[PDB]
Design a protein around this ligand. Structure first.
Ligand SMILES: Nc1ncnc2c1ncn2[C@@H]1O[C@H](COP(=O)(O)OP(=O)(O)OP(=O)(O)O)[C@@H](O)[C@H]1O
Ligand SMILES: [Zn+2]
Ligand SMILES: [Zn+2]
Lengths: 231, 222
């Protein structure tokens, strides 16, 4: 029942994002907001619209809102923040969680800038190009390290058939663990991980948590931090 | 290279269906599917061939726990590989009951067949995969499961997905020979703990063939 009452924004509907959207659609999430800027049978149609069609056929009860814009532009970032602030299940209420499943540093940093301003909790996820590592990170602005608090973390791992076979499998594991964390966070059960790595070569799942950097480059991080230390 | 291997999957529900699909998408040479009550395995074969028609399929619907059907099961593990008359490369147990798992154990000890066993609890909070190399590591009869600790309308399919994903990654590492294959890998969804270990065989194991295989393994080491 309770999962129907939440909205989740997914930025990037590629490898990890699409598996994640599919899994949440099958769980019966109330609403998915999908953001991407790429185009892909649906070979040619925008990625978000193609995803929307596939997903709505999987579960017609899930409400979809899709956006095709590049969020790294100031103009489009305004629209992105409007939808994060107001795109919840009830219009005018925030989304309950944002998931970054983008593939580049600039987009991750853009999500981070928005969430620090808004005080929006989010999860950042990635699969390395080596196809044998990935991670998820939970970011609660003011309470845990934000994406800007420290430079990019890397999961330690270290021919052609190997990467081709492993990549979708690694994406599937990372998406599975990301979704389990979304459910634990929304449904309030078990313990949500703040950082969880996955080394597929060794079946190693390093976990830890990072505290915020009082000298973070993002002033809004510094601000959320001040507000957290008050409460 | 992955196209050159055959894998037998026992149990086509839950973890088994996710696992078969992932292997089908990777382009494994052949899948042999066993389950028992268009049947369950026939339905699976149909969906899977639609996903990747490069993959060959052989399905069976008999109850492998009878002695008569057990002979057919062992026959197919020994001869059902990519080239007819060759062994499958790996057997996967994705069944949700003790008798089937033990039955698979008994076959694999008699044949010297390496296999992986997988499971997810009813509660969805935990699951595991286990590699078994008869004579070299603990078989299913050697010891009971002792590793500790390792909503449902949502958690269950998610846990099954994580277990299937880690199982498949281990199948690829086994067949393609990269990274390290885990012997026991548990998953605790509540806490995000992934206990791992490996266990030697029980020299007094109840399975007569596990004992036979151990003697054989010790004999080759020296
Ligand atoms: N600034 C951005 N705004 C919106 N979407 C973005 C932005 N930057 C990256 N993305 C999207 O994030 C997604 C990440 O997907 P991923 O890298 O896992 O797959 P991929 O390598 O793009 O392969 P495929 O295109 O087959 O999915 C991509 O769809 C990409 O277009
Ligand atoms: Zn910060
Ligand atoms: Zn034994």
């Amino acid at each position: 029942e309770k999962i129907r009452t939440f909205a989740v924004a997914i930025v990037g509907v590629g490898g990890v994002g699409s598996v994640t959207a599919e899994m949440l659609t099958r769980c019966g999430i109330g609403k998915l907001l999908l953001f991407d800027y790429d185009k892909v049978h649906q070979a040619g149609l925008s990625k978000v619209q193609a995803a929307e069609h596939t997903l709505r056929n999987i579960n017609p009860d899930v409400l979809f809102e899709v956006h095709n814009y590049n969020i790294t532009t100031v103009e489009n970032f305004q629209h992105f923040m409007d939808r994060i602030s107001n795109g919840g299940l009830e219009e005018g209420k925030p989304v309950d969680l944002v998931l970054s499943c983008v593939d580049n540093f600039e987009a991750r940093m853009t999500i981070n800038t928005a969430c620090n301003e808004l005080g929006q909790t989010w999860m950042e996820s990635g699969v390395s190009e080596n196809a044998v590592s990935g991670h998820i990170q939970l970011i609660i602005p003011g309470e845990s390290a934000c994406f800007a608090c420290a430079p990019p973390l890397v999961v330690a791992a270290n021919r052609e058939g190997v990467c081709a076979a492993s990549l979708p499998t690694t994406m599937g594991v990372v998406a599975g663990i990301l979704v389990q964390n979304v459910l634990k966070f929304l449904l309030n059960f078990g313990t949500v991980s703040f950082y969880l790595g996955y080394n597929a070569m060794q079946d190693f799942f390093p976990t830890m948590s990072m505290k915020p950097n009082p000298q973070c480059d993002d002033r809004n991080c510094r601000k959320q931090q001040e507000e957290y230390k008050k409460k």
